[PDB]
Design an enzyme around this catalytic site. Structure first.
Site, PDB file in Angstrom:
ATOM      1  N   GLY A   1       0.704  -1.264   0.018  1.00 52.31           N
ATOM      2  CA  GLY A   1       0.133  -0.075   0.047  1.00 52.31           C
ATOM      3  C   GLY A   1       0.741   1.297  -0.132  1.00 52.31           C
TER       4      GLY A   1
ATOM      5  N   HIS B   1      -9.849   0.025   0.486  1.00 57.74           N
ATOM      6  CA  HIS B   1      -9.334   1.306   1.194  1.00 57.74           C
ATOM      7  C   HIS B   1      -9.099   2.439   0.345  1.00 57.74           C
ATOM      8  CE1 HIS B   1      -6.134   3.348   3.854  1.00 57.74           C
ATOM      9  NE2 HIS B   1      -7.414   3.508   4.612  1.00 57.74           N
TER      10      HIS B   1
ATOM     11  N   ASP C   1      -9.914   4.124   7.025  1.00 50.78           N
ATOM     12  CA  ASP C   1      -8.844   3.437   7.814  1.00 50.78           C
ATOM     13  C   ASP C   1      -9.366   2.410   8.717  1.00 50.78           C
ATOM     14  OD1 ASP C   1      -7.533   5.415   6.301  1.00 50.78           O
ATOM     15  OD2 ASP C   1      -7.018   6.617   8.147  1.00 50.78           O
TER      16      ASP C   1
HETATM   17  C1  LIG Z   1       2.467   2.385  14.505  1.00 47.39           C
HETATM   18  C2  LIG Z   1       2.017   3.792  13.713  1.00 47.39           C
HETATM   19  C3  LIG Z   1       2.089   3.519  12.449  1.00 47.39           C
HETATM   20  C4  LIG Z   1       2.476   4.348  11.269  1.00 47.39           C
HETATM   21  C5  LIG Z   1       3.201   3.856   9.971  1.00 47.39           C
HETATM   22  C6  LIG Z   1       2.460   3.966   8.872  1.00 47.39           C
HETATM   23  C7  LIG Z   1       1.822   2.716   8.645  1.00 47.39           C
HETATM   24  C8  LIG Z   1       1.416   2.603   7.054  1.00 47.39           C
HETATM   25  C9  LIG Z   1       0.830   1.096   6.395  1.00 47.39           C
HETATM   26  C10 LIG Z   1      -0.631   1.250   6.338  1.00 47.39           C
HETATM   27  C11 LIG Z   1      -0.950   0.167   5.335  1.00 47.39           C
HETATM   28  C12 LIG Z   1      -2.295   0.573   4.359  1.00 47.39           C
HETATM   29  C13 LIG Z   1      -1.628   1.751   3.725  1.00 47.39           C
HETATM   30  C14 LIG Z   1      -2.421   2.289   2.358  1.00 47.39           C
HETATM   31  O1  LIG Z   1      -2.781   1.191   1.380  1.00 47.39           O
HETATM   32  O2  LIG Z   1      -2.266   3.304   2.150  1.00 47.39           O
END
Ligand SMILES: CCCCCCCCCCCCCC(=O)O
Length: 121
Positions: A29, A47, A89
């Site tokens: 992602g 999403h 989200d």
């Molecule tokens: C523990 C705090 C988390 C902050 C780190 C960012 C996480 C990003 C991964 C998210 C997964 C889906 C994202 C998407 O598809 O845009």
């Protein structure tokens, strides 16, 4: 923003969001969507579609508030874009937890032009 989203993922799935989901499949992602590779990859695909119907706010950058109550992500917003954002989200996170059993490390760092073009949302 990403912080809230990664937190939800973490809290729902128990996994390090960036590790499990930062580069997973054709949609999870970070650079567009693509023919989902599986249940997990499809979660991120919805999403993104969910993202795109969003107007007054940016989902990378805008922070919203949410609660963990009875181990349930509870959105804390009245603002429409942030509520829907929070809800996109939230649902991505649920959906990722629900499909953990098919999660496949084979797609964790999948190369993303090894991905078929996505259907319009
Ligand atoms: C523990 C705090 C988390 C902050 C780190 C960012 C996480 C990003 C991964 C998210 C997964 C889906 C994202 C998407 O598809 O845009």
């Amino acid at each position: 923003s990403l912080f809230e989203l990664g937190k939800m993922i973490l809290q729902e799935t128990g996994k390090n969001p960036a590790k499990s989901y930062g580069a997973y499949g054709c949609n999870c992602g970070v650079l567009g969507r693509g023919g989902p590779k599986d249940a997990t990859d499809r979660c991120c695909y919805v999403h993104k579609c969910c993202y795109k119907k969003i107007t007054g706010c940016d989902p990378k950058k805008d922070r919203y508030s949410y609660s963990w109550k009875d181990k349930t992500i509870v959105c804390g917003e009245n603002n429409p874009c942030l509520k829907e954002l929070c809800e996109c989200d939230k649902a991505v996170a649920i959906c990722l937890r629900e499909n953990l059993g098919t999660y496949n490390k084979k797609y964790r760092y999948h190369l993303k032009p090894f991905c078929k073009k996505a259907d319009p949302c």
